[PDB]
Write a protein that binds this DNA or RNA. Structure first.
Lengths: 238, 227
DNA sequence: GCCGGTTAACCGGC
DNA sequence: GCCGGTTAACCGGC
């Protein structure tokens, strides 16, 4: 992680600051890691400007030089082709990372989550378990196991004042422990502070291991659906 | 529908929720009928000070289906004395007359945007609902209708859920198992008893649940199996 | 503690 | 046209 070596300072500077503290975190990185800090859409824009001679989606989809990167970063075909110095990319919540850290072609997909301590703890949607599945399949089909890391920074607040923060990395957690809430848009849910960080194997093992977990949960869920949405309603079908 | 008769009036000459307007108009012409859910709850209790146990304030609903669709839950009802408007309510607007309830949902649509069916109601919840209905013979207790408002107010629409063909309700399982549709596209030619509707809905739900179970093996299992 | 259903909408592939 | 996955979080039952 590019930001871990300076996570302590972020924690310090944030604790006390008076829902989107995301902006304050971004502002920070921009001042301490100016050469590495990009918003995802900024990155795409900058990448397209360096090559004004390359137009059309299929062509601009080549500029990534990585099928996993293309998958995690690229916008829709129409949007890519309609991109121009005149018609640039803007925010877009559906963008994978909230903050992109790049260096030596290594990418840290950082997301910033915020929780309202006052409220009763409720694990938020962290990411699509399917999207993660596909992502893991790309890493293997293409053998890209040393390209990006998916990390999270959490900022706890109350009535708004930041009271504390947390920092964890997805690829350092036990893939078999990730909770997949199928009803909630098949999204993994957890609190950064509660994320397990003891994975010992390689990034490829993780990828494989996650798939086993995803596939296994999808099997179980298919069955539990008959359990919860079929059996208890047989009564009335006569 | 207590609103249907005046649905012609909910639009004349005018001069991002336009839901306020929808509520104020109903309050004006159907004052002694129109109320918000949180506001209505305040009444049921404010008309009964003697009751305080959360298991008592519950039986006041004098209906197991209504209780299911309208109650706020133990802790919430127990700590009553306010009841804020919680988007978690079943309906945005409620209208009762002679022991009958019209549960109205007000949807607004950004017309300029690309047509994307929005979440209407949880298919699962609607299943439990039909269950309570049938096992309670309460097929003449309430209606679940919808009023949609387009804008860029370009136009509006109004439909009744218990008036559409069940088999046509698209249950988008990934999107929190919610039925999706724009009011203006909802089917409106169902012919049968209300009890017929509920039963028909359950068949559709169960069948779709099985179809989803199957879909999961082919889209989330089959293609990742190899690894 | 443990557990998982619900908001209001919103694209992009083919 | 036709189809369905994604946001950022949020809460009550036993």
């Amino acid at each position: 992680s590019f930001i871990k070596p300076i996570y302590q300072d972020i924690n310090s500077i944030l604790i006390g600051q008076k829902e989107p503290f995301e902006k304050l975190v971004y502002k920070f990185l921009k001042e301490n890691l100016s050469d590495l800090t990009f918003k995802q859409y900024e990155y795409l824009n900058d990448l397209f400007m360096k090559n004004p001679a390359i137009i059309g989606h299929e062509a601009r989809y080549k500029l990534f030089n990585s099928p996993t990167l293309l998958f995690l970063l690229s916008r829709g075909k129409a949007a890519t082709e309609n991109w121009s110095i005149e018609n640039l990319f803007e925010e877009k919540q559906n963008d994978t990372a909230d903050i992109l850290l790049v260096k030596d072609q290594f990418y840290e997909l950082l997301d910033v989550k915020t929780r309202n301590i006052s409220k009763s703890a409720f694990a938020p949607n962290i990411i699509s378990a399917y999207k993660l599945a596909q992502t893991c399949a790309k890493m293997i089909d293409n053998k890209e196991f040393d390209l990006f890391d998916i990390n999270y920074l959490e900022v706890d607040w109350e009535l708004l004042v930041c009271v504390s923060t947390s920092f964890a990395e997805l690829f350092k957690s036990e893939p078999s422990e990730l909770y997949i809430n199928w009803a909630a848009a098949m999204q993994i849910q957890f609190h950064v502070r509660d994320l397990d960080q003891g994975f010992n194997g390689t990034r490829e093992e993780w990828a494989k291991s996650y798939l086993k977990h995803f596939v296994t949960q999808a099997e179980q869920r298919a069955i539990s659906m008959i359990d919860k949405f079929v059996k208890p309603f047989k009564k009335y079908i006569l």
